[PDB]
From Swiss-Prot, chain D:
The active site is at C12 (nucleophile), H263 (proton acceptor). Belongs to the peptidase C19 family. Induction: By growth factors. It comes from the Eukaryota. The lineage of its organism: Eukaryota, Metazoa, Chordata, Craniata, Vertebrata. This is Ubiquitin carboxyl-terminal hydrolase 9X. It comes from Homo sapiens. Residues 3-330 form the USP domain. Interacts with SMAD4, MARK4, NUAK1 and BIRC5/survivin. Interacts with DCX. Interacts with OTUD4 and USP7; the interaction is direct. Zn(2+) binds at C133, H135, C177, C180. Escapes X-inactivation.
């Protein structure tokens, strides 16, 4: 079927992301089709080394490719990479796509990854105690959604639209009126990308225990997604080109906040599970299995040990979806 | 022979502002030079109406033999954020100023000219976020027509201008989200001045609300400001010079003063006559002479603050020391840059 | 009870113009309300100041004429010093004077008054006939200069501004957008109309053969009432206030190089301002208007030989209107 | 390598200009960066023009195909109101003017500056220096190209000089000084007030002949340099004699053949030269001065013609030659071209 990627030590965060980029036809074919002084050669070398990986992923009959070249080339925000250290896979995704678009521009090409993954918000402030309204465009490569106060994607996406009331003491300063005014601040989507990448905000820091911490809360997301209710236009239609998406990719994280393990479930343009060296078949077409493998949450574990005693302990599903990739229905 | 402006009832907020614009030569000569002046469709005519009536006023200020002019056309024409103006009601002089420069600029643009008041009065900040726990830095441009400085927690202009540069440290639980690193990171948020205007209008933030009393209030705190001002330490260049990667000097030309309570009270303008061959007090219909060249008078009329009043009553038989507040003080400072009729404000652009 | 102005030698061109500006209410009262490149600004304020003095004496004093010694000393024509015995073009004088007075005001803070009162503009239009483009720019004017040699009356020569010139054939207009020559009408419409409209009859020119300036004394009639609408941007556009009354005729009499200037002006009734003497006149009557201002040839009836010979000879009326001043009804 | 553009019939005038615009980086990256594009008629029209140029620039940057077929542009584009017959030849400069005007209108309407006017736009100071009187008259006149005379000069510098020398309005044809109210001998000249970042220069090779009822082409010899100093033709430069002003040649839009037909193509420099001839973008020897001369300067030569046997020698014209030169200023992606202004 497919070709894997060897893990150097703790580079599943590289693999899980690359493999997801590889499986977007537009980025695969885009990258393979390409014929401060140090930074320019760096970025091109990253693009150049990604090409090689893409080449071997298309070509090879071997079960996995070792990307020794990428590992030596890659730097994460300038500094050198310890291949035994785990890193935020999103942080890695952000560093790679910047560098690729930097590398393309540097060879007089149009910014591909920004085009395929880039959207923008209309940041709207509607003043309620005065007639002023303010908006600026703010760009995004990922949509970052709340996991701790919502149980599914649609509800957390609606939070962008609902906004926050800037009120009383915490009121918005209207520049024109020269006063504090009660005001809705919300974010609508102005430009929807051909590929919509969504981060489930599962990671944070525990002050009381001096360490990074993972929220494994239950959180569900659909196979088909309609973004119209969250767009500028859509909200205008309510208030007085394709807006539909299908799930194609799930980047999972499994284990602790500091370490743990990354892998990627992806559709064949059925579902395959890309886990470092081994790209296996899986039941992601089944909804219960989608639920157990990705939605997270608690359950009652039924523990046995030589199977003589039976314990019943609350367990966390510590394996769950971190990043969702959705493809626009006209793409 | 300076002409005043009639007060309709509570219109000193218009007069004080208008007079300050009239006395900026580039604006005066710019506005008077615009020919062809004499819903979406409604607003372009409205805005040109505003421009037209200002031209008229400016005309009479420049020419009339009278002690004052009565700008009825303007009063009838002017609408503050849509609503028609009740001439008996006091308003924030800065609101008025904002509404007025916006309308003028929109009139001039509709007529193919540049946004004159935005060119003369407009600057811009560089809103810089400097991450301390990661190598990232984020910058965006934000325009301003007025620079707004804190009066409560500072005692002079220079120190409160320094607050823009010193910034605020976004830390701990309140830490900045670096979107590339995808984590909370300790960060300095600050504003440096990117573009300095030929005329720099400065708001002393003297008004707020009291929830306990359900009324607007005035902070009459002491606050001093100099006659010459160097803006370099607060600019992008000047801070880049200090860190290691056109005139920046300014002369005080005007003080728009507010006197009395936050709800009502009274506005008037002290302004320099820009001359080759001094200060005058423009108070609605009477433009009187004044001692604003002297620092002690400047201090008493504009710097605000508390003092000990020698109060005399009981047909002069009782002297009492009561603590008093100077409720008359500077609200808006006008500063004019040292390298300041410019032909390029009148030229067609569209 | 009007006051005259003394002629220094050949300064009737000054008087004729000054007296014509004195009788414009808005210019009189405007001037009377005003109390290398460094010397230019100081020169101009001298000129304004000195005119104010003349305006002062014309109104207040009851002498038969004023002598403007200071204005003579002060006034310079395009940098150079005035020779008080040298005749000059009264329009040159007018242009140099209105420039100076507006330059003086602008420096003193006031707005340009004379430009306001006398200034108009043209929409300089080019209408391409062989392509769809049109080009318009705005030119300004203090006087309107009309052809006299090829027209017999004011309305028809004003009409010439509108008729324009056809830029055709080998002399065609380059359309900048199309990048080729195209047949084009170039015309001037009046964009802005001044409260006082001043109009030049183009009577003077040069004769290369004789090495001297020429005067054309051709017949040329002008009405007491003028409608300017047909010559305006808006009037032409409608078709495809603006009313004036005559208030002053600046006359020139005699030879082109020398000769003599005086001003007929309305008070209610016409008065002839001729240097020191301000006699009354019959300019209310149309035959006098015609004989004094319109020019043209006539058959002179000459008597000589102690009244024993009558001979008929063609004669030119060498006394005629040079500059008309019209005031806008409002 | 480079992507060509398909000729629709007689649309090499479109392709030759577009390609030259595509190769100006500040225009390329400027046009591609404009979002929100993807009397009432003209606002939609002009934005449509911009949008369809964006897709072309899209395909020229991206495509691995040998040429792109700009079907959307052909449907969209109108020349002075009328729909364009794709079989008709047109003046390449007439196309260029219509296109820059339209792009500037689209941009102004979207709140951005007039990009093409910022990059290609200069202005003259139309001076009139009265010699018989102390008056001087001056007005600003904008230009999108410099138009230079080919017939009475042999090279760029001498014909640029002509602008400075001017015409003497004298004798009966003397200038009317408004202030002096007389005719006065006067120099009328055009000096360059503002120099653009890209300088487009028209060589005036086309006119009408009245005898023969048809358009004609002057193929006279006219040479131009690779490096060009514009200081002596500017206001300040003449003010000396009484931002960089140096330019590098980056572009030559050539016309080949008859006045009313013929063929356009574009030699453009690689920021080494390349020949953009509709669908085929080929290497060329434009770095060599003999090749520059033979391909662009025009003029007559002695042709050596061979037939069967027969070796005749007939005088002949180079009917292939430069029409429009594109020079790029030495101090020239600029964010201030894409900022909001309205
Ligand atoms: Zn407001
Ligand atoms: Zn960071
Ligand atoms: Zn045309
Ligand atoms: Zn002259």
């Amino acid at each position: 079927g497919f070709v894997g990627l060897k893990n150097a030590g703790a580079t599943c965060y590289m693999n899980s992301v690359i493999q997801q980029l590889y499986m977007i036809p537009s980025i695969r074919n885009g990258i393979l089709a390409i014929e401060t002084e140090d930074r320019a050669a760096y970025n091109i070398g990253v693009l150049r080394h990604l090409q090689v990986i893409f080449g071997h992923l298309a070509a090879s009959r071997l079960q996995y490719y070792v990307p020794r070249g990428f590992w030596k080339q890659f730097r994460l925000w300038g500094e050198p990479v310890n291949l035994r250290e785990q890193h935020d896979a999103l942080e890695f995704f952000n560093s790679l796509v910047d560098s690729l678009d930097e590398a393309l521009k540097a060879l007089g090409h149009p910014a591909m990854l920004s085009k395929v993954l880039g959207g923008s918000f209309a940041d709207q402030k509607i003043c309620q105690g005065c007639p002023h309204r303010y908006e600026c465009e703010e760009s995004f490569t990922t949509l970052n959604v709340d996991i701790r106060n919502h149980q599914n994607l649609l509800d957390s996406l609606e939070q962008y639209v609902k906004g926050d009331l800037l009120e009383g003491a915490n009121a918005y300063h209207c520049e024109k009126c020269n006063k504090k005014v009660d005001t809705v601040k919300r974010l609508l989507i102005k430009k929807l990308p051909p590929v919509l990448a969504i981060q489930l905000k599962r990671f944070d820091y525990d002050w009381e225990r001096e360490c990074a911490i993972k929220f494994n809360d239950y959180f569900e997301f659909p196979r088909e997604l309609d973004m119209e209710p969250y767009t500028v236009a859509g909200v205008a239609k309510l208030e007085g080109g394709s807006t539909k998406y299908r799930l194609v990719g799930v980047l999972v994280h499994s284990g602790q906040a500091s370490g743990g393990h990354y892998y990627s479930y992806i559709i064949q343009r059925r579902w395959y599970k890309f886990d470092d060296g081994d790209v296996t078949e899986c039941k992601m077409d089944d909804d219960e299995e989608m639920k157990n493998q990705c939605f997270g949450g608690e359950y009652m574990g039924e523990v046995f040990d030589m199977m003589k005693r039976m314990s019943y302990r609350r367990q966390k599903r510590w394996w769950n979806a971190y990043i969702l990739f959705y493809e626009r229905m006209d793409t």
